[PDB]
Structure formats: C-alpha cells, structure tokens
Amino acid sequence: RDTEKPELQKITVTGGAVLEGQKFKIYREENFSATIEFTDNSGRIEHAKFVPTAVPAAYPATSTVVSFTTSNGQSISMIVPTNKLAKDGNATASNPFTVSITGSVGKNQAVNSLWTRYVFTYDQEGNFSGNTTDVGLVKDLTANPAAIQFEVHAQSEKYEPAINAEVNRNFTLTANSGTVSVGEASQYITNATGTPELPTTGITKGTRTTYTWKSGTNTNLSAGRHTLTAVVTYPDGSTDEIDVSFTVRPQT
Ligand SMILES: [Ca+2]
Ligand SMILES: [Ca+2]
C-alpha cells in the first residue's frame, strides 16, 4: 500500500510578485497570479485544500475557492480545480496537480503585512503533503512545506526612475528674460534602462503614477547651475525621489 506523501514540486508566479521559496513578495496595486504543482507516487491526488493553520493537516478534505481581503476592496484568492481531483494520472511528473492563486493588495495595506496559509494535498490512502508544524509558532516558514506566505512591499521598492537622456536640460535665456521655466517634471523622467516600466494606473479606481517637483522647488530658474528633486508617486502612494541637474546660461 501507498505510504508516501504527495510532493509539492514547483511554484511559478507572474505579474506583481516575486517568489522566494514559499513566500510571495507582492507589490501593492498590481495583479499577480501563481501556480503550485504537486505529484504523487500513485499518480493520483484525491483531495486538495487551502486552510489558515496546520491543525487539520491530516484530515483529507477539499476547498474550492478561499480568499482574504487585502484593503481597498482587493483580495487574494486560492483556487483548487476540484473537478480534476480523484482521477487516475492527475498528479504525475508530466501532468502535475496544479492549484492557482490570483489577486492584488490595496494601497492602504501596510508594508510588511504578512499572511500565512497552508496548502495540503491527499492521495487516495490519505497520505498528505507537508506536515503538522505551525510555522508561526516556530518562527520558520520552511518548517512546514505546506506553508505559503504573502508579504506586502511598496511599489517604490520595485521601480527605479531615471532621467530621459534625450530631453535637453541646458537652457539659454532669451534676450530679455532673467529666468527660464523647467516646466513639468514628467518630461524628464522615465524608467532606468533594463528596469520595469513605471506603472500608469493601479487597481484601486482613480490611482495613477504622478510626476511632480518636490515641495519647495523653485521652477523659474535664473542663470547658473541647479539641482531639482523630482518625486515619482506610485499608485500605492509610495515614492521615489531623483535629483535632476539643469544649467541656465545668459544669451551671448
Ligand atoms: Ca502517495
Ligand atoms: Ca525605487
């Protein structure tokens, strides 16, 4: 008889999260999705569930869709395709049993917020993936292979604004002006080469990236050299600040 536990083989993620082992590092106001793949030596998994603790690890049972709120009307969902359970060959290396995760986190959810959930799969004999350890109690995500975490990060951690090299910042005054206006910050700012394109909208309706001059910035510049600070505010309200040089010369 089968006395071998099903085995979590692989996790994949897409969109607004980064995977570190069993932890999903999620940037606010961005959709993400994930898959977790399991195999069993029998080739068949009978039950699969997501639960908030490890207490019911050993009890074979199935969940459909479970979720939790993440502020700003947003949520994370954990989904089992239950109609694929309890079929021969549904959990082989070439056809792993796959559960999905999808959602997003609202801007009002604090940075470093952390949720723990547990995913269990069961073969027909009732052997289960993972174990009964409470990773909160032992302060160690890795102590239970069934544990997964969702950790909230600021969009400012993901993005790196840079200066658009093609836009002129060396100005010459006209014949009869003491100043020249630098105008809008947005014309000078882009994403650093090889880093993610800056967001436009968030998930919360009405959220969007802004490009402004830092409070206290004078924008009508007289002759000389200047350094101005531009503020990129992401949809989640976190910010990068980038210093931008300008030169103002008199007309000959
Ligand atoms: Ca088995
Ligand atoms: Ca940044």
Residue numbers in the entry: 125 to 376
Can you list sentences taken from the study reporting this PDB entry?
The long-wavelength beamline I23 at Diamond Light Source overcomes these limitations and extends the accessible wavelength range to λ = 5.9 Å. Native-SAD uses light atoms naturally occurring in proteins or bound to proteins.
Calcium is used less often because its K-edge is located at a longer wavelength (λ = 3.07 Å), typically not accessible at standard MX beamlines. Compared to sulfur, the calcium anomalous signal is stronger and more efficient for phasing.
